């Protein structure tokens, strides 16, 4: 019925794609008007931190189309399809890994690739938990609200927005820039090549997995993970930071079990 209310058990998948009443939403909750650009509506807002963090994680749905962010000619930048990540970054994975296999013991390079994707799983947990869900640690500033919106907020706000799920390369370049420079500073050259290639491929897997968790009927062995992450969306967002695996959730004691309570 009401999509703004969290449930202890996930409702029908058909109710997750129900278009939200715009005017009724802005009237009932006095948050954001979905019929008008959201970003400028945030930069020019009088919201308190707790109010924003409480309302943004209560999912909406614009409908068949995609919600407006800028409303002008900058809007195309905010529409990034699922197939964008592989076609843009997989060729980079291959090249970096390709170089390593031509100037280094191939087996050791393969190993460094694997540790690359492992380190990636860890980074996934770390970013998703501490960076993507900054939440209560946020300052009382609209710029911070907009930034958090761009990073991970908008996805929770409009989950079934098929063009605002994956990370736009414009942002991913910024976020990956520190990791890349760091890897090549510490590790030997071709080691850095292999390792970074691994991490990047891991990222591609992460974004693709994360997408198809929302917009596809996956094979049975992944349906558990789908239920898991969808419970991170519609039940409790203080837990279940692993999207590829709840491994780091078991490790760091943030597993989203059936005994998990609802959020505040
Ligand atoms: Zn998601
Ligand atoms: Zn999240």
Asked if residue 7 belongs to a domain, the reply is: no
Residues 6 or more apart whose Cβ sits within 8 Å of residue 81: 162, 163, 166
Q: Beta strands of the chain (E only): which ranges?
A: none
Give a yes or no: residue 9 inside a domain.
Answer: no
Instruction: Report yes or no on 261 lying in a domain.
Output: no
In 3D space, the residue among 215, 224, 219 whose CA is nearest the CA of residue 243 turns out to be 224
Round to whole Å and give the CA distance between 28 and 18.
17
Q: How many residues does the chain have?
A: 264
Question: How far is residue 211's CA from residue 107's CA, in Å, rounded to a whole number?
Answer: 32
Which contacts (CB < 8 Å, 24+ apart) does range 169-178 have? 169/80, 169/84, 169/85, 169/88, 169/89, 170/77, 172/89, 172/203, 175/127, 176/200, 176/203
Residues 244, 205 contacting (CB under 8 angstroms)? yes
Binding-site members for Zn(2+) are 128, 133, 152, 155-156, 210, 214, 229, 232-233
Using CA atoms, how far apart are residues 246 and 228, in angstroms rounded to an integer? 8
Dump the DSSP string for 233-246: HHT-SSS---SS-S
Question: Checking phi first, is residue 36 left (phi over 0); if not, alpha (psi -120 to 50) or beta?
Answer: beta
Closest C-alpha among 81, 89, 76 to residue 200: 89
Centroid of ligand 2 to alpha carbon of 24 (angstroms): 26
Ligand 1 centre to CA of 229 (Å) is 7
Q: For residue 83, is it within any domain?
A: yes
Please report which ligand is nearest the Cα atom of 239: 2
Binding-site residues from annotation: 128, 133, 152, 155-156, 210, 214, 229, 232-233
CA dihedral angle for residue 48, residue 143, residue 233, residue 118, rounded to 10 degrees: -140
Residue 73 belongs to a domain: yes
Are 78 and 164 a contacting pair, CB within 8 Å? yes
Is residue 113, in this structure, part of any structural domain at all?
Answer: yes
What is the count of structural domains for the chain?
1
For residue 237, how far is its CA from the centre of ligand 2 (angstroms)?
6
User: Which residue bears the tokens 């930071």?
Assistant: 241
Q: Which residue range(s) make up the domain with 63?
A: 15-251
**Can you give the resolution of this entry in Å?**
3.8
| Other CB atoms within 10 A of residue 201 CB | 21
**Residue 43: is it exposed, middle or buried by C-beta count within 10 angstroms (0-12/13-18/19+)?**
exposed
The Cα–Cα gap between 206 and 132 comes to 14
How many helices and strands (H and E) does the chain possess?
Answer: 11, 0
CA 230 to ligand 2 centroid distance, Å: 10
Q: Is the sign of the CA dihedral 104, 106, 112, 116 positive or negative?
A: positive
Please name the method used to determine this structure: X-ray
Ligand nearest, relative to CA of residue 225 = 1
Q: Is 264 within a domain?
A: no
Note whether residue 45 is domain-resident.
Answer: yes
Q: CA 138, 172, 99 angle in degrees (round to 5)?
A: 140
Q: Which ligand is nearest to the CA of 240?
A: 2
- Chain-centroid distance of CA 88 in Å reads 18
The alpha carbon of 158 and the centre of ligand 1 are apart by a number of angstroms equal to 9
Instruction: Give Rg (Cα) of the chain.
Output: 19
Token readout for 142 is 């609209």
Extended strands (E) in 8-113: none
| Dist CA 47 CA 160 (whole Å) | 25
Rounded to the nearest angstrom, the distance between the alpha carbon of 193 and the centre of ligand 2 is: 30
């Amino acid at each position: 019925f009401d999509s703004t209310t969290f449930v202890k058990e996930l409702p029908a998948e058909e109710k997750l794609s129900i278009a939200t009443d715009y005017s009724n939403d802005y009237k009932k909750h006095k948050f954001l008007d979905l019929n008008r650009p959201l970003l400028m509506q945030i930069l020019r807002s009088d919201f308190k931190k707790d109010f924003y963090v409480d309302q943004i994680h209560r999912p909406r749905h614009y409908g068949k189309g995609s919600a407006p962010l800028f409303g002008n000619f900058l809007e195309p930048l905010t529409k990034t399809a699922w197939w964008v990540v592989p076609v843009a970054w997989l060729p980079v994975v291959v090249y970096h890994m390709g170089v390593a296999l031509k100037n280094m013991n191939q087996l050791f390079a393969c190993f460094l690739f694997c540790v690359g994707v492992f380190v990636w799983t860890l980074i996934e947990y770390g970013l998703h938990r501490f960076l993507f869900h900054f939440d209560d640690w946020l300052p009382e500033s609209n710029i911070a609200f907009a930034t958090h919106f761009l990073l991970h907020g908008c996805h929770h706000y409009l989950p079934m927005d098929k063009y605002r799920l994956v990370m736009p390369p414009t942002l991913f370049v910024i976020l990956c820039a520190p990791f890349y420079k760091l890897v090549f500073a510490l590790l030997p050259l071709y080691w850095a090549y292999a390792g970074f290639a691994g991490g990047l491929f891991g990222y591609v897997c992460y974004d693709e997995c994360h997408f198809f968790l929302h917009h596809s009927k996956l094979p049975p062995f992944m349906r558990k993970l789908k239920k898991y992450h969808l419970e991170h969306h519609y039940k409790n967002y203080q837990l279940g930071f692993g999207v590829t695996s709840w491994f780091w959730d078991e490790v760091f004691g943030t597993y989203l079990g059936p005994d998990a309570p609802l959020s505040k």
